[PDB]
Symmetry: D2
Subunit: 499 residues, 4 copies
Amino acid sequence: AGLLEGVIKEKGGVPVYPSYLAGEWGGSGQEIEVKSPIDLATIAKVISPSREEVERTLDVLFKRGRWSARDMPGTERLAVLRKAADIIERNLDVFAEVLVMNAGKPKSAAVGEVKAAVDRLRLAELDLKKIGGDYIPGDWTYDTLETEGLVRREPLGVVAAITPFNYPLFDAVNKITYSFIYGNAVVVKPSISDPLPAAMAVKALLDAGFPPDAIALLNLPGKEAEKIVADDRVAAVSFTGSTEVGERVVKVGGVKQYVMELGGGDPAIVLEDADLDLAADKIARGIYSYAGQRCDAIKLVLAERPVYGKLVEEVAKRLSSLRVGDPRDPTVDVGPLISPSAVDEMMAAIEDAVEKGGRVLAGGRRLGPTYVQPTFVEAPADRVKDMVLYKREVFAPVALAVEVKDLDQAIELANGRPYGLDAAVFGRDVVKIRRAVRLLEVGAIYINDMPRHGIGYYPFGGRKKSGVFREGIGYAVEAVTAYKTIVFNYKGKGVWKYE
Amino acid sequence: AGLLEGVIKEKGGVPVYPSYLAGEWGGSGQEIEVKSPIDLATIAKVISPSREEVERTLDVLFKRGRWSARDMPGTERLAVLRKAADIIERNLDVFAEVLVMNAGKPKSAAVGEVKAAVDRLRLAELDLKKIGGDYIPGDWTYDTLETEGLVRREPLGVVAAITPFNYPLFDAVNKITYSFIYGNAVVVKPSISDPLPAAMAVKALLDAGFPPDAIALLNLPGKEAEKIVADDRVAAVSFTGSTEVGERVVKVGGVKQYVMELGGGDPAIVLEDADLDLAADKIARGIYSYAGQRCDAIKLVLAERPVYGKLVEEVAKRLSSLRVGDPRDPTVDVGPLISPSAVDEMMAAIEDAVEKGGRVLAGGRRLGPTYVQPTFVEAPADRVKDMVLYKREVFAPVALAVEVKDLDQAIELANGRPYGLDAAVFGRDVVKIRRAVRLLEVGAIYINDMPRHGIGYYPFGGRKKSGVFREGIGYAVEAVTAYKTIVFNYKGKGVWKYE
Amino acid sequence: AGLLEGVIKEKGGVPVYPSYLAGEWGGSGQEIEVKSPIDLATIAKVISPSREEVERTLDVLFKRGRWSARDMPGTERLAVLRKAADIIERNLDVFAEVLVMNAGKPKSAAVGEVKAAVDRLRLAELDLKKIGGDYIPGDWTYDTLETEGLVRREPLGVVAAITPFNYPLFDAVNKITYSFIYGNAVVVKPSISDPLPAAMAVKALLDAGFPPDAIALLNLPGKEAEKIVADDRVAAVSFTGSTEVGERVVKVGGVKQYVMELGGGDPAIVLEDADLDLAADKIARGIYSYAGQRCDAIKLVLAERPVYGKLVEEVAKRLSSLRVGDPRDPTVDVGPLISPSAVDEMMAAIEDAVEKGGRVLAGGRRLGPTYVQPTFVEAPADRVKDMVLYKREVFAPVALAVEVKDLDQAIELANGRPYGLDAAVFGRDVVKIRRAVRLLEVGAIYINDMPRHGIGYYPFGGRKKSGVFREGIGYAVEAVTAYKTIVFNYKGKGVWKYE
Amino acid sequence: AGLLEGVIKEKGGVPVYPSYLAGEWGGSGQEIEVKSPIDLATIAKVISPSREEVERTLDVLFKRGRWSARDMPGTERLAVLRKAADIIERNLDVFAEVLVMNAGKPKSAAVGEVKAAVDRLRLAELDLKKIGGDYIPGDWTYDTLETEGLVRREPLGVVAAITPFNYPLFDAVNKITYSFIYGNAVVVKPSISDPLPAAMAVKALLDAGFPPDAIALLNLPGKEAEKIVADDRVAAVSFTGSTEVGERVVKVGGVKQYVMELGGGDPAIVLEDADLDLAADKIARGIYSYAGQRCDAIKLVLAERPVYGKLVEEVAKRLSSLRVGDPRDPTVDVGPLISPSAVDEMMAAIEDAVEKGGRVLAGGRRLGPTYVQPTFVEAPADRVKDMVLYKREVFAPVALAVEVKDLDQAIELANGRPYGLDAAVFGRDVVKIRRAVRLLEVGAIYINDMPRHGIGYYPFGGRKKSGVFREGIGYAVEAVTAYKTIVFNYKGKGVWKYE
Ligand SMILES: NC(=O)c1ccc[n+]([C@@H]2O[C@H](COP(=O)([O-])OP(=O)(O)OC[C@H]3O[C@@H](n4cnc5c(N)ncnc54)[C@H](O)[C@@H]3O)[C@@H](O)[C@H]2O)c1
Ligand code: NA
Ligand code: NA
Ligand code: NA
Ligand code: NA
């Protein structure tokens, strides 16, 4: 359609999407089927590049793309991004439909993601708040007298952006945006599960003027991407995905600059003075949004004795009164999970919790190979820590509810999971809140709201098993830029007179 | 002596230095002999910890040290560091003698290093220029209206500091200083080649009040240290050493925060308008200081046609008029190289250059198993790139001299090595200098001076094979600290009236 | 026309422009004739407000405008500014024609100013690089332990923007932009000499959505404006104009936040190694642009012995080969000066220089009541300091040329004027340049270019008689914003455990 | 004694303190008697300088001191300040005794001030967090392409520090410290009421190595100081004192850089959820400390209906159980007010409140010409606004207590005074606190503590009648430093390739 007009190869009934090889759309490696979780049907195919095409693409990115991106002044890069935003925006419905179909995303969620992608592109100028360099006077030390330094940021070169299946459009646009804005060339490697949105975004950027040899989109399955991560021409790896793959990526990449957003779930804590209506609403939402397939989804709810009853009651009502089905209905609240495998795991995990003293408070019923009801499992503090739902991230709409004596116990249980992405705290007392802020070991804490990374207006990232470094408007500069120091020596040259 | 009074075990004629196990000096693993490069004699032994002692130490650092360091307010950490500086300073001669003996460092160089270590400790307060956090208003986006965020730094926890043999005292004090100042516990792992200075520095810090369970000094040989790097309780690895080991470290560590200073040599460029007296002096020095065993040692000299003759002549005179011998003589200029193996490599490399069209302009003579003359090898631009001296870092006092047509050719040859730590440029024209600053792919550029990292008053670090990230007063905060974001939600709470 | 359709009162043959009274266009004070310097003819009239209307307007700005501006979120303020930019841009020719007619600005200069105004409005988002606040941890002092502070910027309230005649459009848009972007209401008071462009800009902002009660445009002659400056409801005064008026403004205003851009001329220094073609061109331009009616116009040229001859020769050729006349001709280079009075002063000053040993090298001829030739007067170093052209700012296209022995003498003569706005330095030696940078007492130094403030991409402002504080994208935040500190006390509350 | 050994002229029974004239202690103007508020007796005399000595001193400061301060590298300035701290510290008792005697300060308060002065001097290195400059890339605008700028701070030159009577030692050391640390020369003008401590501090700095011609201490009565403020050689005026004098200072000084800390009192608000024990204690203290002669003293207490009774009861008990008398007794809590005149005003003001419906809840009794009891006057919200105690700052230990319906009314009453220095808020609800933070128009807000500027670890300053700009460690740099911009032009020079 319009955008991918001459790109998509209509062959054998299903549209065939090629990879973009830093100059031309193409590919001559195995073709791979892309399915919809809505009906397990094949909706398209993508052409992966061969080994020689990967090698040739990296060579173009390194030898030419680095310079095309860097030698395009920032004023023009910004124009490129603002124009790409316009193109995506006018093709909004088309972008959204693919998200609904390829990712099983409910209509309102698909529309929200496209819009986040557009805003991210349009606010590229706010990323400049952290682009200026430093001027360091030398007279504060005897050894540096009559000396001085300039510290400025420089693009690293080629950034490999590896994206997860759950934000197939936004994650790719976000990484491309902060990488390009600072002068880098970029290699995008989307989940082979739903690579269509990224293909569309990359086409819009190319139409907008993005230097043709400074970007690549390689539809490669997981382990074939290792080839890219391990290459010396790739100076940085921005990876968003699971902990286990993140580990593999670093061990394969070796010394390089990395940003690792490794998810895991998020705990929510409700203090006795919390507005329970606000909390119940925000928590229910954090649990089921996009069928819990959000890195920042609430997986554990801790509530102090006096509000626990009401709170868990309201959240249960809110969850069971939800409509599950095909994501196309603007009436549906929850669509399918990405694969039948994901549902299998959620069910096995719910059973595990029950066998260990847990009781289902809402949901619990599987509705098909990829459909399930958002579940809320109550569990006694003394047994919760051994439950699979606590010890692991079950990427589905399921959370545990645990009653706690006080803030200290809530903090301890929240910190007991191996992850540390975000945490949410509902309450009003400034002291209790300040204590929780200090002691919760996570990259971000949301006071009186559900965790929501949005477009990264506020930086976010993990602690512990949730990764390292941050993404965010401005802050992402640390991940795809290197400092360059220039020290000038004027010793005895008469600039200063002993100072 | 005084400092390590009850610590050193005088047994079997040679002093035996134990490891510090986050509470008590000890160790029950193999004992290892420490030799002096001055005479290849055994001057001490160090006790490495057993597997159980490594495990127990990490456990203490993680469970107790994190909190002892963090729960000691900054005002007190600063007092600890200022007191440790006083102790090292009054034991200056003793610290220097060990450097001379254990590292083969010339007296003036040993004294300089001790003093750099003292200054680094005393200037810990300048590290606070980058400790403050950010306050982000939320009204610049519609989605964040009536919201706002705080971004503050937090210690990561346990930092593993792995140090090289050539700055055995300073590197250990530098890493301990920037790690502790931000609230982290630290595990120090010095080169097993010359671990004595670090043992002494750690003792001075402990005497100064450094939280006893927040530091460890493990005398472990290279590959036994892997155990520490790979442990999940180690949240950061500050590594200074060679490229090849740096790579191994990351592949073993996996996802973690890293600073990798991987050295390599540095090229020096002399423009036609350069003060040749200043240049000849600075370049000779950059070539031979500490027998070229400096990451920032000059390994390649590029000089434009019109000054090449004079320049290389003066540098040759300066180099051959140097006195080599035992580092104790305040008269000696160059002491021994750390091992006979290192000299073997320098000789093999000089031969390689000769066989490939190179001509020795100064030095070239080996004077013993660990002694050699600082060598200056001239080479034609058309053959230099294939020489071992160009393609690799030969950690010894040896550099190549290459005549070039112009700045473009100089820049191209400087960038042809696989490293990118620093570069030096001598000249006066602002345009040529600005061009070189932009195009030299290195972490730092020194205008009209030899590259010298000093105490990191100006940040430094590598590009390409020279590593990632920076160290420096203030800038090191990015390597041992993680951001924590706190987002407050006041939507509809009446703080703002639509804004 | 289009923009000021229902605003302009076509009465008595000449268009009558009313003042904008924070809600409605109007005015009932004396009417004042506005003339064109091109033909001394009346081209319009402006209605000044009466004393009661000034009082009522300030009251509206204080009681309502402060809140309308502040309570409009930044995301919307930005939209208002981007839309105002679009409106000005599509009315470009109309804006330019008024500049040509009302200010006597050459066509290319008028177009440049309109465009600068449009860019300034569109880049309002870059002003956010300095809008974030600070988060100060309290453990670095014993007295502040268990305490912490937040420092954030807040609008001051009502900013009075007083503008000069020479950048009638840009200065007004610049001040309105940085004042509004941070949440302030604004009172604009343009030169009564050429207030038409400001009236048009304010109308475009109002059409774009600028909160109607948060802005005012008062066509008041100089001393009647004092009433506004002295009012307690005006929290800040952004004044661009002459030194003498600036002084009066502060003495009338009393304690308030001020930015004073008080001009004066600028000296240019040419080192012996300078590209004389670049220098001669840039200097000629700095001397005659807009008939020298630029605060940053070059009024003194200092050139080292060896290049002096050539340099002054080339600049003289360039100046006398200029075409003076009506600014409408896209062929004319120099239009008229703002008033016959200004020309009188330039002639008297040129005579003074001649009587004191000076010799005219180019120009010197008056061509009419408001027209003159750009003049270049040579003068011996030993007598220049007593010349009116040196001691004062003669706001016309006239500069002195003085030969100097060396950089020290050039710096001394440049610093001998009572002003210190900018200075220009042409040359290539990094040491000489660095010395001049340190010792020239001015707000800004331009290396190898003529001084040009542009839209303030780089901050600018004066030293000495040239004023205080800076304007510039981002930096202007200090002039119309106040810090607010919030200190939180958690002493003994268990957040920290002695830290 | 020791410090002022050869300086003090013991003549006619009373010690005679000379002024310091930027080189030598001396003075030949009228002698002025200095009295103690403890017994109204003459305890010393100070020699004011004649008109010629003021003129000569300014000339030395301008021509020589600017350069002596600036040409002393920062590393040395820091040493000077650390040594001055040591000297003051070992003369602690002597410094304290003079404060007790000359200012009537209770012993514990006098000791606290000396210590604050010592800490301020020792933490001068923390002021460097805001000393670095900026490096601005030019490719973000088409007009600035191939251009770039450096922005760095520069000392303004001579700073005139005018200090109030209530912090005679600290204010002088604070201003001297932040002025000198950035490279400025300083003229100190203390209250002629208690100039002894400043004389002692200046002597300690001179003994510590402070450039002899870069500092001056002029014992001049109020209006004779105008001569200094109005001089063009004084580039900045740091003034701490009353509103009315501050206004005079600016009107006399004209265009200059100013910091005006103009005091006024501070309101305290107690929310219904506040810890009343903490609040009652902190508020009582804020009311009586140094007999209310603190710019940040609490002058108005607003308490919500439900806690008002208890709160005002506890504060009343705490206030009447205080011991008034000679400040020497380490038992006394409140010493005398600075002059009988000050007590007269407090009594007249208390009467005014009573006549207007107010009722005394504690104190109210005058105990002598300079002694009074700290008074707490209750007042109905409907009549408080017309009371002298509300409308003005009565510099004495007296505050009003007003019961309020809710936070909105508290905020409105707090904002009704003409001042806006600080405010205090006691409570725990994050929303109410956030609202108060936004709407209280003051320079600083203290949550759950009494307002205390301390040594300026957190910046402080006023809004409204309380002045402009801030003082504080780091932030004071904006008041005594000017930016200098250097723009480099490389257009067409081949540094960048269109970028
Ligand atoms: N805002 C703050 O941070 C702060 C701090 C401490 C004190 N204060 C305020 O200062 C006042 C108490 O001090 P004070 O009574 O000595 O007040 P003040 O205003 O009389 O002090 C003025 C200082 O300025 C000098 N001075 C007086 N007239 C002058 C003139 N015409 N020209 C130049 N200099 C002149 C005085 O000798 C004295 O040194 C109170 O109002 C208090 O709130 C404010
Ligand atoms: Na690698
Ligand atoms: Na790992
Ligand atoms: Na005033
Ligand atoms: Na003045």
